[PDB]
Design a protein around this ligand. Structure first.
Ligand SMILES: OCCc1ccccc1
Ligand SMILES: OCCc1ccccc1
Ligand code: NA
Ligand code: NA
Ligand SMILES: [Zn+2]
Ligand SMILES: [Zn+2]
Lengths: 331, 331
């Protein structure tokens, strides 16, 4: 009946319109604290995040799920501060992305399970802030270490009921391997969201996963390097497909009957150090709406394409609630 | 330079006294200790262990240690300051980058890295005001492209501040030669550089040639040995099969070749170690129960017994470190 946020537990009904894959800051463990000037200042970053969150809130966003793990440099204190200042619920994550340091990479599945459980059950660091989701990732075939992470993520989810969300190389169909690993651990597909799924047009891939019960994360909607074909780093990161092409995947999935398995987001951020310098500026120019892009542009676009109001509400409110609600497997 | 920066503030050169130049309170990863303190029992337990060990080293005559843990070694300056104060041992903190930088660091330019190192030396680490007194870098064989950038930034930061540079090397692969070339290409004086883990090789030719050029030779792995643990692969790979006596004899060898003024001795010890296999700490503590006190309790006496005069021993353990650590700008 309750979802853990950086301000404490909230009831399922309080979540409202939720963005399921976002970040306050995309960084590295200890980075923000060791070199805050990379972002101007910690204060400047916080203020930027507050402005953006307030704008998203004005557009109807009530909660965001910050899928920043330990290795994405998640700073829960920052999350709590901006959540309170902007009055937006923020769900924190545990798990490991693709940049784990040696102290993590050398751990066993059992040790990692303990670490994920710690963050979900006791709290992140010494803050008492409990994670409400487990984030994992692969970029093509999983590495041996990534397989361990996925297994530990499954074990932690099974013990706590918190869902798992992933980063994929959609092109490479990472989702299938991820699903395989999760199922080998007994995890229900309904507890998993296969992310960045809009990065591919393979509707066969998407639909096959949906059919098995997985949640499909169409969270890269505003990501596009169109108009910047000349910026190699940006093109590499953002792609050359339009936001409309990506958004159309939502309707496609709806049309195929999987409206209840879709999760939409922007995968936006206010600071980004884990890539080339200046990527944030480039991204902000591409999508000035930031996290508000979904409600301001995507939802109206889909409605214009014939998606009914109730399906839109179902996707942005109902689906996230059901996914985030901690749910233990029936015995 | 009339003062050396320590975690408790500046000290005069005379106050350094007997100094261990390559040590660690804890060998970890950025943000690891704060995120998963239970890996070490607890933060409190680790601190207590460190205080006991530092107090024992102090009883044996050690007055200062140089903790060469960088951002990526998970250096926690607050922990260092706490233990320094509780044990009453001076601790010099480091800046630089070891071999496990996260993406936020690895994507940076030489100019960016330079600014980060300067920040830690001139202003302070994190928001603590604790200023680094040394710059740590590393290679493990031929430098990676990023490592070349790190070495160049380290040289630039050293040139602007006067603080020395110390390195991690794959000694048997003669990394010191490439390191030296890079440093020299930036105009850094060899006298501001310590080529570490030099006792890991039996190639005296390599060591004397670097000494002849003015570099400091760090014979800092003296107690590291897996003799008696052949059966333990991880430990063997890490510690080697050469005896502590064989390593200590290199100190004598260099003295005999006329380079007593260019030798720095240490143990490369730690109280916690998460960046390797689990349980490595226990294995190490069994191998060398004296921990950091190994140098003064066993090595100095051993050398004396082999004919090294007291004045020479004092010069190596007090004078050399003082000269090295004193901030010195190029004329
Ligand atoms: O009950 C059907 C309403 C609904 C539509 C879309 C997604 C979840 C719920
Ligand atoms: O000649 C001065 C005495 C000395 C000996 C060894 C190292 C540093 C100094
Ligand atoms: Na919980
Ligand atoms: Na300084
Ligand atoms: Zn993301
Ligand atoms: Zn070391």
């Amino acid at each position: 009946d309750r979802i853990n946020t950086v301000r404490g537990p909230i009831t399922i009904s309080e979540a409202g319109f939720t963005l399921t894959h976002e970040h306050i800051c995309g960084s590295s463990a200890g980075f923000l604290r060791a070199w805050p000037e990379f972002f101007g200042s910690r204060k400047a970053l916080a203020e930027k995040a507050v402005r953006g969150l307030r704008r998203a809130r004005a557009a109807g966003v009530r909660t965001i799920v910050d899928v920043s793990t330990f290795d994405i440099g998640r700073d829960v204190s920052l999350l709590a501060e901006v959540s309170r200042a902007a009055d937006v619920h923020i769900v924190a994550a545990t798990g490991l992305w693709f940049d784990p340091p040696l102290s993590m990479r050398l751990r066993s599945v059992e040790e990692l399970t303990q670490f994920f459980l710690r963050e979900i059950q006791y709290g992140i660091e010494d803050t008492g802030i409990r994670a409400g989701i487990i984030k994992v990732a692969t970029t093509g075939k999983a590495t041996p270490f990534q397989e361990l992470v996925l297994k530990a993520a499954a074990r932690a989810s099974l013990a706590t009921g918190v869902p798992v969300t992933t980063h994929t190389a959609a092109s490479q169909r990472d989702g299938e391997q991820q699903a395989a690993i999760f199922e080998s651990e007994g995890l229900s597909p309904s507890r998993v969201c296969i992310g960045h799924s809009d990065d591919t047009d393979d509707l066969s891939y998407l639909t096959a996963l949906a059919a098995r019960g997985y949640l499909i994360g169409l969270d890269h909607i505003p990501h596009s390097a169109i108009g910047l074909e000349d910026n190699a780093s940006a093109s590499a990161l953002l792609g050359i497909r339009s936001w409309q092409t990506r958004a159309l995947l939502i309707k496609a999935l709806i049309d195929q009957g999987y409206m209840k398995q879709i999760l939409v987001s922007n995968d936006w951020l206010f600071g980004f150090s884990s890539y080339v310098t200046n990527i944030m500026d480039v991204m902000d120019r591409v999508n000035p709406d930031g996290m508000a892009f979904i409600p301001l542009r995507v939802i109206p676009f889909l409605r214009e394409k014939g998606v009914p109001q109730e399906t839109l509400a179902g996707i942005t409110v109902t689906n996230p609630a059901r996914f985030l609600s901690p749910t233990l497997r029936a015995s």
